[PDB]
């Protein structure tokens, strides 16, 4: 019945049609199938998907970038990503992601200053979350400290 209906409007019953290229004007062999499909636009737009960040506001505890676009938040490196970096052998990139881009408070400012001055050097220091963990463990009756 579809083939019959195509014959009433004077169209090729096969459904295919010869097409030409718009840039060269050379006919495509193997005639192409054209038609009318009902296309609909979904609620996943790229305007709401893009997000970028260089330096914003951190949290009072653990001093890390906030999160998932919650007031210009940062993105989450994870256990699988650090496994990937270790498999690559990316010690310096791993240390950088661990300290400079994160809760190393005295190192974030130094790295920003060196970048603006054109130095590209890192002062790793020590993350703030480890200090928070040490304080939380000492809040229980468990002595813990770092030796020399």
């Amino acid at each position: 019945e579809i083939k019959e209906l195509l014959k009433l409007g004077d169209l090729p019953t096969s459904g295919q049609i010869r097409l030409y290229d718009g840039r060269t004007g050379e006919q495509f062999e193997r005639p192409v199938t054209v038609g009318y499909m009902y296309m609909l636009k979904l609620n996943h737009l790229v305007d709401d998907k893009m997000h970028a960040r260089s330096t914003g506001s951190y949290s009072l505890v653990t001093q890390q970038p906030l999160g998932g676009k919650a007031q210009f938040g940062g993105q989450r490196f994870g256990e699988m990503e650090v496994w990937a970096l270790e498999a690559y052998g990316a010690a310096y990139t791993l240390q950088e992601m661990l300290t400079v881009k994160s809760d190393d408070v005295n190192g974030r400012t130094k790295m920003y200053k060196n970048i603006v001055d054109g130095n590209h050097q890192m002062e790793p220091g020590m993350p703030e979350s480890f200090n928070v963990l040490l304080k939380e463990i000492r809040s229980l009756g468990i002595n813990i400290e770092l030796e020399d």
């Binding site: 096969s14 459904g15 295919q16 097409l19 290229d21 495509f28 062999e29 193997r30 005639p31 192409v32 199938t33």
Partner: protein
């Protein structure tokens, strides 16, 4: 083809070869037309007798 290129020549020729293969394949696939339709898939006439 890619594996032999890598094994014989090296890394730079095989990277260039991969890029050029992608370019030429993309071009000629579009130049071929290569559509799909209802009549493209055919049903054997013996299907009814087998059933």
């Amino acid at each position: 083809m890619l594996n032999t290129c890598y094994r014989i020549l090296g890394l730079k020729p095989t990277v260039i070869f991969a890029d050029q293969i992608m370019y030429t394949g993309f071009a000629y696939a579009a130049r071929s037309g290569a559509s799909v339709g209802i009549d493209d898939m055919v049903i054997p006439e013996k299907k009814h007798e087998i059933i």
